[PDB]
């Protein structure tokens, strides 16, 4: 019986070359595709910019065009999904989780174009949703697709490629190779049984997809907070308290995102039109705020450096927060195509900055800089809600480049997972996949 | 599927009692490593103060240098050969076994044997790293608490034993991330599913690190400063680097294994010839620890100096061959002690030299020798022990040059890829296989 182990250990890490060479392909394709989806959404916000320039005069007219364009780009995506692939609604992450369990269909002929264009619409519109959702789900279908098109057979290639696809799509979405690899092994893979996924392949894919996003997007970061200060040992307790705050609120937030999916479905009863309409209404309210309080709308990445340098009054932060809990729900709960990572980074960075601000004057002797509690709280919803700390910590670390905060960060993070488990929260990904798998067998 | 729904709704709900124990494994592995480390220091320290007393006559000081190194060597070689022969070598594969339930976690014997066994070999200035000691110790500190509280069932028995190993890897490099990563990447049961709580591994890895911090802060183990960056058109050079490492990774495995055989013949298993040859080997180090201070030691001292490029091109080749020699001798003679630390030193030097050749074959590239150092540093860690992920997150936390993350990943995956195709094997799982096979032999 052990006799077997000896035979396996002499065999370990010898993934069949053909599965490796195909990871390098899925990579380059998921890579380029993100860059596309990316340059796309940009142009679209940019056009909506140039179009507010033309109506420079007349104020209510401005608000109107700001509302309408976004409503119009919204719908186009709401429709595109409710019509040709209703699986590309929402993040699209748990759908790839399901697919690795073989419980969901990897319908890539439907999803590749629906998600790509569906997102370009919602994002280009400036709704509160992140590139990840789109780029990860797209990445998986880029995998499945090159798998089928080369008729590679057997459990391993069908898992490996499907996994190196999702990974490459998350690395390209935050310029974050490590956060990628880590995302699969911590969060994507089957959480309860053994699976046959080549780690050395996920790596080849996550490199190729990053060299693509490098080739095109180099010499500017998505987040630049510069080199912040350090954390003296007698400071640490404060990030544990930060971590408790995040951890009690993480599940309250999950209870909200789920309840809103239901409370939102009531308003259209599943009807492809009431839906695409409510969608234009929500994406419309965004393009408005995209221009009246440009902090309350958008992906988040823009307000991260501003909140971290501390340049917001204490009220402003509370306002941005409540206002963003409202805008982030509406967008993700209405099941428009688009991830929920990005807006959770933004959400945490704010609650982090505010906690740090209070701490900054409650302890002058500590020589605090509200900024550090920003960079602690940035990955903290990523841990109390999605419940996947390790991933989010390697993430925050690769974007903010502040390795000297690694201790406070882990604490805030672990604080949060711990407190969310004892206040009965669940992994927000696996909770959705569960409603979906359970609502599938709920038609017998 | 019916079941999947049920479990998704249940995931990440590790039993409180398992968490609270990870917390204590942690703190204990933590403090322990600090001890082992403050220990080794003191010992090399005394051997210096004793070289100052003999400041005049030369061959006298050569002798004293050979002598107490040989003396601290045997002390450890004996200590292991008598009271716990599993604490010889790295000690890492033994814990992998243990997690597979295939070796025994004999903590009553190992804790003290490894601890004092190491202080001996390392204090002496042999070419072995602190992890070996500190990881194995960590696991035993895990097992133990688990016994002492009679926590029952497969989960606690794996979880604690894993959080233990992690926390001692962390404290060994000040590297929390590398730690958790080491478990999921290389330590866990590679072929069957296991029930290890990752949320606990974290708690231990934190508490371990806070102990190490409380005592060891305000100085890094490696300080290379903020090095330059990597222009896109320079990446192919780190692929070439990764292929050199990947062909040589397996050659080095074959030498470590073969040397364990070619050294076993010198004593036949004989508790005395062994302890004797050990004093010889460890004596050789204490000599070179003072005649070519680069040839001897853990490595952490020459990583800075090679990366600033301050070595002539010959000196590098010299240091390198001289190291493949001293590294083997020490690790293959089954002295207690890790092989990570000296593979870092090895890679860093091969890296620096590749970099140096690159620096003048490409004046247009505006190269810094330095950066191929910091890509090569974790390269053996992936060509040999063949676990890149862990070794990359490692070099990252030590050298803090996140802007080299691309060349580093490439030189790394380059190596794993090229070892796999010139038929190399994970040097850990290779060792545990010799052992588990030599058991029912």
């Amino acid at each position: 019986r052990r006799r077997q182990l000896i035979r396996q250990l002499l065999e370990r890490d010898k993934t069949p070359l053909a599965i490796l060479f195909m990871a390098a392909v899925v990579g380059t394709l998921v890579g380029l595709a993100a860059v596309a989806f990316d340059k796309g959404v940009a142009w679209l916000q940019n056009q909506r910019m140039g179009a507010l320039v033309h109506t420079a005069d007349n104020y209510p007219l401005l608000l109107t065009v700001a509302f309408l364009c976004s409503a119009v780009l919204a719908m186009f995506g709401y429709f595109l999904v409710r019509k040709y692939a209703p699986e590309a609604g929402g993040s699209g992450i748990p759908e790839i989780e399901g697919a690795l369990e073989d419980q969901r269909p990897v319908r890539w002929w439907r999803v590749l174009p629906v998600k790509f264009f569906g997102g370009l619409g919602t994002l280009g519109g400036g709704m509160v949703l992140g590139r990840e959702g789109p780029t990860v789900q797209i990445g998986g279908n880029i995998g499945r697709m090159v798998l089928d098109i080369f008729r590679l057979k057997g459990d391993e290639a069908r898992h490996t490629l499907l996994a190196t696809g999702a990974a490459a799509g998350l690395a390209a979405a935050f310029n974050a190779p490590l956060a990628g690899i880590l995302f699969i092994i911590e969060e994507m893979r089957p959480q309860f049984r053994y699976t046959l996924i080549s780690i050395k392949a996920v790596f080849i894919g996550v490199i190729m997809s990053t060299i693509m996003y490098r080739i095109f997007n180099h010499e500017v970061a998505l987040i630049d907070v510069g080199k912040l200060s350090d954390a003296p040992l007698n400071t640490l307790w404060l990030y544990l308290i930060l971590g408790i705050i995040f951890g009690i609120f993480g599940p309250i937030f999950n209870k909200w995102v789920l309840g809103m999916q239901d409370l939102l479905h009531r308003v259209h009863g599943g009807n492809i039109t009431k839906w695409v309409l409510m969608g234009g209404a929500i994406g419309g309210l965004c393009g408005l705020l995209g221009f009246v309080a440009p902090a309350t709308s958008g992906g988040g990445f823009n307000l991260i450096p501003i909140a971290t340098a501390g340049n917001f009054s204490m009220g402003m932060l509370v306002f941005i927060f409540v206002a963003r809990v409202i805008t982030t729900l509406l967008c993700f709960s209405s099941g428009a195509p688009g991830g929920i990572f990005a807006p959770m980074l933004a959400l945490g960075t704010v609650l982090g900055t505010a906690f740090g601000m209070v701490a900054v004057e409650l302890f002058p002797q500590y020589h605090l800089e509200a900024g550090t509690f920003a960079i602690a709280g940035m990955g903290a919803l990523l841990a109390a809600s999605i419940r996947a700390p390790l991933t989010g910590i390697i993430l925050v670390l690769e974007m903010t480049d502040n390795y000297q905060l690694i201790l406070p960060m882990i604490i805030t993070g672990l604080g949060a997972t711990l407190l969310a488990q004892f206040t009965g929260g669940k992994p927000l990904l696996s909770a959705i996949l569960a409603r979906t798998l359970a609502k599938q067998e709920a038609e017998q | 599927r019916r079941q999947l729904i049920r479990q998704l709704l249940e995931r990440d709900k590790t039993p409180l009692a398992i968490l609270f124990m990870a917390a204590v494994v942690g703190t204990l592995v933590g403090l322990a490593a600090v001890a082992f480390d403050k220990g080794v220091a003191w010992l090399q320290n005394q051997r210096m103060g004793a070289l100052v007393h003999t400041a005049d006559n030369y061959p006298l000081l050569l002798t004293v240098a050979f002598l107490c190194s040989a003396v601290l060597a045997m002390f450890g070689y004996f200590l292991v050969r008598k009271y716990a022969p599993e604490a010889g070598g790295s000690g890492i594969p033994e814990i992998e076994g243990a997690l597979e339930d295939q070796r025994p976690v004999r903590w009553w014997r190992v804790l003290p044997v490894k601890f004092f066994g190491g202080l001996g070999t390392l204090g002496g200035g042999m070419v072995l790293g602190r992890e070996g000691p500190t990881v194995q110790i960590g696991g035993n500190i895990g097992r133990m608490v688990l016994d002492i509280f009679r926590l029952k069932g497969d989960e606690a028995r794996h979880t604690l034993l894993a959080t233990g190993a992690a926390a001692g890897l962390a404290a060994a490099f000040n590297a929390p991330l590398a730690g958790i990563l080491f478990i999921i990447e290389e330590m866990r049961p590679q072929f069957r599913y296991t029930l290890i709580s990752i949320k606990a591994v974290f708690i231990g890895v934190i508490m371990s690190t806070i102990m190490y911090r409380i005592f060891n802060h305000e100085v890094a183990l490696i300080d290379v400063g903020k090095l330059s960056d990597a222009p896109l058109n320079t990446l192919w050079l780190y692929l070439i680097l990764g292929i050199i490492f990947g062909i040589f990774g397996p050659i080095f495995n074959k030498w470590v294994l073969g040397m364990q055989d070619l050294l076993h013949r010198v004593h036949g298993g004989n508790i005395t010839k062994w302890v004797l040859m050990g004093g010889a080997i460890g004596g050789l180090c204490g000599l070179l620890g003072f005649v070519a201070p680069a040839t001897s030691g853990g490595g952490f001292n020459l990583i800075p100096i090679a990366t600033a490029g301050n070595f002539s091109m010959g000196m590098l080749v010299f240091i390198f061959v001289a190291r493949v020699i001293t590294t083997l001798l020490c690790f293959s003679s089954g002295a207690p002690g890790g092989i990570f630390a000296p593979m870092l030193a090895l890679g860093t030097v091969l890296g620096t030299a590749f970099g140096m050749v690159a620096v003048e074959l490409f004046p247009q590239y505006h190269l810094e020798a330095g950066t191929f150092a910091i890509a090569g540093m974790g390269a053996l860690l992936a060509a040999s022990i063949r676990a890149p992920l862990t070794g990359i997150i490692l070099v990252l936390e030590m050298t803090d040059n996140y802007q080299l993350i691309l060349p580093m990943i490439i030189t790394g995956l380059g190596a794993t890829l090229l070892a796999q195709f010139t038929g190399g094997k994970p040097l850990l799982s290779a060792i545990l296989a010799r052992t588990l096979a030599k058991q029912e032999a």
Partner: antibody, heavy 120, light 107 residues
Framework: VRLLESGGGLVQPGGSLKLSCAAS????????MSWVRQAPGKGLKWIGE????????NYTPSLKDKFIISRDNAKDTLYLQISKVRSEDTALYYC??????????????WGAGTTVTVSS | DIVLTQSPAIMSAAPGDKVTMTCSAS?????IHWYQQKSGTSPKRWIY???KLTSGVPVRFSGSGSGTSYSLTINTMEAEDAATYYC?????????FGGGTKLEILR
């Protein structure tokens, strides 16, 4: 590292002066800087401290606008302006780089001082 | 504001002697620091974090304590150990200093 504070001397009572402290040999940012004074024979009492980018500036419980600390990051200098000088301000003035171990902060490296005489 | 009170305002001891001054806080404080000032010289940091020795400082030095009462100790005092020693604390803002303790060589 060296901290060289200049610009002391003889002030008339009621007038004011601008002490300057010039610092070489260490990365002048990353660090908080802080002024402290000593009335000839008598305690050390702390004037105030400034962070690296001038966003936090704390002073000792003292009259509304008695002291203006500032720092010029590029010229590597720390200033201190004292205004309406009465004679209790007659003391020797030292600058100092702040650090910590566990993070209960200490005064890391002091300079020579300069003397301020307040008299008519 | 926390007031530290020094032990012997002034005191003399023969060269070779166990010497002990005392910081006596008005309330609680933790991890105090010690500074050394020779005549017309600028203060040096001597002991930090109640007992860690500023790298450089002779090993004969060693302070400690806690709660409300701390103390610096020379173990066999010397020539060069004539100075003034100030305890400083920053456990609570704003931070503060002692009356000083004047250590004069006895002969």
């Amino acid at each position: 590292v060296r901290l060289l504070e200049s610009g002391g001397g003889l002030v008339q009572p009621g007038g004011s002066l601008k002490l300057s402290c010039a610092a070489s040999g260490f990365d002048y940012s990353r660090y908080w800087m802080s002024w402290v004074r000593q009335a000839p024979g008598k305690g050390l009492k702390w004037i105030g401290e400034i962070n690296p980018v001038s966003s936090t500036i704390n002073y000792t419980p003292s009259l509304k606008d008695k002291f203006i600390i500032s720092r010029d990051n590029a010229k590597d200098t720390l200033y201190l302006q004292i205004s309406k000088v009465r004679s209790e301000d007659t003391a020797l003035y030292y600058c100092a780089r702040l650090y910590y171990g566990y993070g209960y902060w200490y005064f890391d490296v002091w300079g020579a001082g300069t003397t301020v005489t307040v008299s008519s | 504001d926390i007031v530290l009170t020094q032990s012997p305002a002034i005191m003399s001891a023969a060269p070779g002697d166990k010497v002990t001054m005392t910081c006596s806080a008005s309330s609680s404080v933790s991890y105090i620091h010690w500074y050394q000032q020779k005549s017309g010289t600028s203060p040096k940091r001597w002991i930090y974090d109640t007992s860690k020795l500023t790298s450089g400082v002779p090993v004969r030095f060693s302070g400690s304590g806690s709660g409300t009462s701390y103390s610096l100790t020379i173990n066999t005092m010397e020539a060069e150990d004539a100075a003034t020693y100030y305890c400083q604390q920053w456990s609570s803002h704003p931070q503060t200093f002692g009356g000083g303790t004047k250590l004069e060589i006895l002969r």
